Design a binder for this molecule. Sequence first.
Ligand SMILES: Nc1ncnc2c1ncn2[C@@H]1O[C@H](COP(=O)(O)OP(=O)(O)O)[C@@H](O)[C@H]1O
Ligand SMILES: Nc1ncnc2c1ncn2[C@@H]1O[C@H](COP(=O)(O)OP(=O)(O)O)[C@@H](O)[C@H]1O
Ligand SMILES: Nc1ncnc2c1ncn2[C@@H]1O[C@H](COP(=O)(O)OP(=O)(O)O)[C@@H](O)[C@H]1O
Ligand SMILES: Nc1ncnc2c1ncn2[C@@H]1O[C@H](COP(=O)(O)OP(=O)(O)O)[C@@H](O)[C@H]1O
Lengths: 146, 443, 434, 439, 434
Amino acid sequence: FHRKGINEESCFSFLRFIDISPAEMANLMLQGLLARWLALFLSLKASYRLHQLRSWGAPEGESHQRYLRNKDFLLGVNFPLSFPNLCSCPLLKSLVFSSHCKAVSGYSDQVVHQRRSATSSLRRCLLTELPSFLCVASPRVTAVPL
Amino acid sequence: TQRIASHSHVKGLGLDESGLAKQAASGLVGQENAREACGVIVELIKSKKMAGRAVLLAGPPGTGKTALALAIAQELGSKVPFCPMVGSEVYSTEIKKTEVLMENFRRAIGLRIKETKEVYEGEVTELTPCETENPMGGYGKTISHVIIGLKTAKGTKQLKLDPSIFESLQKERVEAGDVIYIEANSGAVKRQGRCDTYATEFDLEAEEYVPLPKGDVHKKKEIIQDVTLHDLDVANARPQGGQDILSMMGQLMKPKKTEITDKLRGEINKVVNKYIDQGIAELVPGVLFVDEVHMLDIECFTYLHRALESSIAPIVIFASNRGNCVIRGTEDITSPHGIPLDLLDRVMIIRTMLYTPQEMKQIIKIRAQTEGINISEEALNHLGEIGTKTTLRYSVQLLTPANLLAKINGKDSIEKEHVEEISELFYDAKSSAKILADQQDKY
Amino acid sequence: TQRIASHSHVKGLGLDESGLAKQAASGLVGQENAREACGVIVELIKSKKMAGRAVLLAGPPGTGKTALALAIAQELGSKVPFCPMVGSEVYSTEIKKTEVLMENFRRAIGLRIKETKEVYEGEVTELTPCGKTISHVIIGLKTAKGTKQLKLDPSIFESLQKERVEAGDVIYIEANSGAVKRQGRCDTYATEFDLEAEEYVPLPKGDVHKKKEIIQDVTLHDLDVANARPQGGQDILSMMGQLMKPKKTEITDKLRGEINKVVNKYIDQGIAELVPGVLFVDEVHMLDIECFTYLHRALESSIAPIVIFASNRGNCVIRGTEDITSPHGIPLDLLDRVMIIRTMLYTPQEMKQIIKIRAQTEGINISEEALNHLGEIGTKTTLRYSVQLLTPANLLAKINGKDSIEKEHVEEISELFYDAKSSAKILADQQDKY
Amino acid sequence: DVTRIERIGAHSHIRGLGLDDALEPRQASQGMVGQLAARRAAGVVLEMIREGKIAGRAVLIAGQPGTGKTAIAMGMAQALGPDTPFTAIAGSEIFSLEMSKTEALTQAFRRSIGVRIKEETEIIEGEVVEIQIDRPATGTGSKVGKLTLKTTEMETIYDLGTKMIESLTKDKVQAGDVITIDKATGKISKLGRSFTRARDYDAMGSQTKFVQCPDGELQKRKEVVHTVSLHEIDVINSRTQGFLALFSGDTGEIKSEVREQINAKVAEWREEGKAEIIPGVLFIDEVHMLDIESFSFLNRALESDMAPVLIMATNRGITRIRGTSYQSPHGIPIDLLDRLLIVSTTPYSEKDTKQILRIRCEEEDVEMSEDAYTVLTRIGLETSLRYAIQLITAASLVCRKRKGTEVQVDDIKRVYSLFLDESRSTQYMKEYQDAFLFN
Amino acid sequence: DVTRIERIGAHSHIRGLGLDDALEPRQASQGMVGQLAARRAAGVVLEMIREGKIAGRAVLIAGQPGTGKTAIAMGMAQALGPDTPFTAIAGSEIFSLEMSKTEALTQAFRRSIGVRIKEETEIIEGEVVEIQIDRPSKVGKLTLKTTEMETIYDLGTKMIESLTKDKVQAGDVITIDKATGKISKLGRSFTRARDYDAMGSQTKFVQCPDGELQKRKEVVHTVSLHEIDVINSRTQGFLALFSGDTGEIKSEVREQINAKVAEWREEGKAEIIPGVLFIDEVHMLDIESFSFLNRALESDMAPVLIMATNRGITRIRGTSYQSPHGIPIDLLDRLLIVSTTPYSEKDTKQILRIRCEEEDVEMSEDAYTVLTRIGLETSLRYAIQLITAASLVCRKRKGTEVQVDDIKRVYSLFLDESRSTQYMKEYQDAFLFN
Ligand SMILES: Nc1ncnc2c1ncn2[C@@H]1O[C@H](COP(=O)(O)OP(=O)(O)O)[C@@H](O)[C@H]1O
Ligand SMILES: Nc1ncnc2c1ncn2[C@@H]1O[C@H](COP(=O)(O)OP(=O)(O)O)[C@@H](O)[C@H]1O
Ligand SMILES: Nc1ncnc2c1ncn2[C@@H]1O[C@H](COP(=O)(O)OP(=O)(O)O)[C@@H](O)[C@H]1O
Ligand SMILES: Nc1ncnc2c1ncn2[C@@H]1O[C@H](COP(=O)(O)OP(=O)(O)O)[C@@H](O)[C@H]1O
């Protein structure tokens, strides 16, 4: 804020266009991984709000077609495939199948046999879970951490 | 105003209905056969039939091979991807060359898919858990639904919602005066904050206020988004979620490119085939332009070998300006254009020739006018002669400094004296090389 | 006591009041021209005015270049920072080659901060807490010289509570840093239980209040490293320092500029002062061509220290080019920037003087005849050979029961150990057998 | 009109090897013409691989450039089938910055031996009528409920335990939905909302597609067939809950002990009759590029009892081996060269080049005159076959530009004059000696 | 007496580019001597940069060693001054181990493009005095104090909770942004620095804010495009700005950045200011990196490149080809060579004078004559370095004015390249490796 001229180079300017406070940045830089983790969690909670604000409210300007508003340097959400947009559009959700908590092999046809009249229906490509039994390996020896 | 680049004037090849090349159209002069061949290539790309076909623009430096690729890009439009590349992008310290090439090949293939967005959004006013008046055996009441009033800059309306949404409302801080939004397809609730209307009831509030929404309470639109096939690869390789120690751990660590396995592509292809067969998404193949191919490696060429005959690879346009040079990665295996012969039999060669002085002068005039510069004929002819003495680039480059010198002297156009002074000041490659040869003992 | 190294016998340049060089002073003899010319460099460093200026020392191996540089380092005292390095240290596996040079350049400039050390210690007599819950806590310290009371802000109270400090423990507190160290329960409560897990210490015999004047030194590179990456903020009681292994990284220029501005501001406020130190490089001929080029830009900067280079190789090929030969393995471009001092060879008189000085420095009594024999054998092969030969003679002489050094001991050692020339001659005759 | 992801490439016409029941190649069948001896040998090795009894067998295909070696490879890949694993790797797809060359070759080898598992589970596909949840007030977190399912013929009511209720809540299942319940694992797959139950609806809380009701009996059996390579089993068992490495490819230099453990476990799995192991084919193309260390690792790795039937390909002559200075045939040291059978290909003639052009035009849907065919064949004999193949599309486009329907000799001559050949480009190249760079 | 972090360097005696209104150089102005044509070309290209209408322009400065290519570049940088980005790097700085030579040049390109943006800022800043809350939605008030007023705010419940979590006490100097509502503690007042005799882990004493309390105004921010790239590179990328941990930013981010910047300039929200990229000692770049500059100078947004080269017709690094300036021909035509000329005797006197007054040194006329003769027979830089030592040697003599004898003494002590090489060959056998 307190500069010696109308036009003078000063760092930390991006702090104004990001939601980071001059105290939040010092905390994030001098506290540690717990502070970083909490800030990350807060950013993934604010991402949905920033997504909607950028995507559905474009009237005129902010200050009558001049200036910039908070969180205008965070353009990572404008992508058509980011998680907020991916959750908003239910079909890209099906186009991004590689979940981080399940074992998906890919797509394979499925055959569903009936019990009456022995009629068998055939299905098209569907997400397939790898069989559980595959995991059989185990280390030879285990050690308590030193 | 947009700043002037080095290829701003190129707006197209300038072809007739019969495909013949005009003498001067769309900022391009001469190279009639090359322009006709590029028009044929444009038709091939628009045909949406072939795959993995390659063309090599071969010619001396400063003859327009780079410009013709941009002309092809401009004539293609903007709904088809066009990925530029140099020969030095493959050499990465994070991932192998044949994966840089594979990722770029997958970049030049784009999708285009349509969907609808439905949302109920606006300011909340009241929450009425409307009950059914007659509880059931063993219970004191039976809530039927929840009445939520939402108002925007257009009007106020009441919506009847499932009772379970109340369980979500208490999960966040859903009080009167906030603005909320609920996705029709998803069904969740999210709070944006208090309205600006109540921004003055205090002097210092920890929360930031958002303006009241303008428009109808229930919005519904249709949007079409375009994603390249490489974006799906990166999206599926690195799942961006927060409810994991793995997702978050990787999102905290330094992000690094990972060699994508071919099994991931095998499933993405299947799913996009299914959705194309269902008529939801439209595939549009594009163009990949490698300039300065002579900087590639023999391993890169040998991978390109197999890469071209694929049924999925896009159309590739190579460009090079080397003579009979040693192939990079070998010892003394010389080859034309620094490209192996076995690869060079899979490409169609387009020859680019030199420029006659008349065409050079026409190019100089076109550059001067596009740049916003006025030049006299007695100076334009001298500049063209100087360029023909040395090269076209050295003639086009002196346009701006001459204009600055004239503006300093106050004149509104360049004369003979300005051009001669600028040429006296700056030097070209040939004279500098002559000076270096003369003064070799003091370098 | 202190182990004796190869450079422990040099104390200074030994220059008189007129700036000339004495024949023998502070452990250095000979090399009159080179030693005297180093005084100009010493005065240049003390002036704290010029920057970037560099110096090269050119001479045959074993002629005193490193000794002269260490004498220069001694002449400046421990106040002036000194950063020694070897050209072979540049090739790292974490950062680029020029980054190491920049880091050493930053290391070769230091700060200076005066302050007062405040020390409290002794037994805790009581802990009394006081917009009403907690404001400050009153603590009572007591030793066997007196008793005092202190007022603590909630941060220090939290630090005490983390150390699991109760009433009746011996505590050490530093007011400046806020450090809290529990030194164990006082001995007077040792009878409270027959078996207690705690350890008991006697009541301190000293002042509760201790004042000192302490002067702290810190180089710029310390500030760059500290502020470059998120400081761990973990000093135990945290498993999050167990995730990411620290690794050396490339410091950006924006940080360095911010650090420069902050240092200017603080030295303008008068809190701290600045000292331009000296960087010293050995095996400079081992620097790659990229490092030699980067030294062109680094040496011409305005915030760079004074650099001294040492090299002994002749007209050898420059590393990284395998085609171009330049004197001292240094490109002509950089070699024109530096200022060159030549180093000569030693006559037998200087040989004998060096041997005698080393012998009296490293604790060996030698007779005149043995000294003459060692001087002759040093003139035969090298200087370092005789200095190496000194110790085994006095190690056998003790075994035989004698104390001094005579002809038989040095002769036996010479017949027992081989120099480089003799071993090379031996290898030639048995060439097909090795 | 619609364009799928698979387009018309250079080998998109070859649908097989074109062999009879007697393994005698035909002159023209299934997109392959000529090259009788190489096709015979390829049929022999294809039958050998189909039998699948001996392991660690290698075959090299050598010949002139543009004589169908890769064509033969694609033909035998298509003839092999989709259910038999086939892996195509270029010569430079192993020099990686994330793992060693030997590790990359080991992964390539283990990626070819597939394991087929038939998984039969009992499922319940039906329409949701109503769901009953009885949350506890305090207690100890025990939940109880009921769930009614209905089809067009039968309906029933099921009780709910403490495990599927959380899954149902996570998937947010309500009335009017059609769901498939997996009895074994317990997952809930969502099909869509029904029609009749949609009449009574609140504001939009779920807007998506529509589906019908599963007819017949409520309980049925489903069957899936999984083909899992050995390499991805290794990756799965190399770390706990590690599955994105199948797609991310982040696992590097897996420990061997895992590899022998997987080998043993696969052996027992084969013995018990649960899963079936099927060897596959590895195709390394342009294999002259492999460093000598890669070849020597291939030596030992080809002697294992789980190695695949790798197929080589080379068009080089007496050339020094990469990374060394020793000359050798095909740029391969004799050690590896002494452990495999070599199949050679012969240069093409006019009669079969004409048929190659004809089948290429049939694939690309291009019509030319017989004189145009003769001119194209003359070009494809004075100049390589690839150039003649490429000129077809350009000639067709030029013909369509003038609103034509049959390609004519004039169009082909125009295209020949427009584009260039390597020989003609080099000829025109010699006259600009000083204009080019680094001659 | 007081020395700042920056002091007298080699290029610190030049302040801007000596020119006229008509771009006519002066014989001696702003610390520059001679090089009239080179300075004219420098002024022309400086005007080209200032206009900032055309993109992707390259200028090369070539000449013999000691002719002032780097001096001209620094004079241009000073004349341009701040507010216009000027990224100066060496040739060997891109050979990193975390990013390829392409990324190390792409980032060096995006770091010379400035974006000016305007922001409306309202901020309250002052020393807290008393905080009062009630227990009935808790209601309270807080009092701020400055040098001019003393005021009370009736803050809301969320502000109560934030203040309780941040643990605000009286005497603290805090700033709040009412647009968002975030507290940024700055420390404690000087007058409140005595109630605790044992300060906590980290506390700072700052003067109380003066002037008006709640300031509302407009500020201008000049941010480089590289910063905008790094911020969106990863989730929390602003750490990499100082850490240097960024590597191989995806190409699908830079295109989005460019599109957004073009949209902003169309809307008038922000304006793009081009800058300069100076690559000193460019004669040692990779043939792979040279080819990358071919397509780097043809983009819509690109700075002006200025290179210096000391090489004549020499081999290109990375290939076995001979070219002028060690640069491929396919790039040299895109450039615009500006040649320099060796200085005359009059230029040599006029250039040593400026350095003498820069170092605050008085020199005699005969001393100037001898120094000019030496600097003509030898390199100019050696003569430039010969004055700093001369001052110290004269100071040792306790004289205020140097003389010819002092210059001769300093000349005899130190050695130049020619005498060092000549003496080196006399006893070259004693040296190592030829
Ligand atoms: N047909 C053309 N019409 C107009 N300008 C041209 C034409 N061909 C080349 N130029 C001009 O020549 C300059 C350099 O050409 P370029 O494409 O870089 O040649 P090369 O690719 O051989 O280096 C460009 O600025 C361009 O404006
Ligand atoms: N003039 C001198 N005065 C005192 N000691 C010397 C002198 N010259 C060399 N030495 C001694 O010689 C030993 C090795 O010489 P050194 O300076 O390391 O050779 P170099 O310059 O090749 O590194 C040092 O321990 C040093 O004490
Ligand atoms: N016997 C054949 N039958 C059908 N097409 C062939 C035959 N031989 C070669 N071709 C065609 O020739 C083209 C080039 O052959 P290619 O695969 O490059 O041979 P190689 O890999 O041995 O150089 C292929 O597109 C292929 O369609
Ligand atoms: N035109 C000039 N005016 C004043 N001083 C100059 C001029 N040119 C060069 N110098 C001085 O000469 C010294 C060496 O010149 P330098 O720029 O290193 O030569 P080069 O351009 O060959 O590297 C520098 O310290 C610089 O201050």
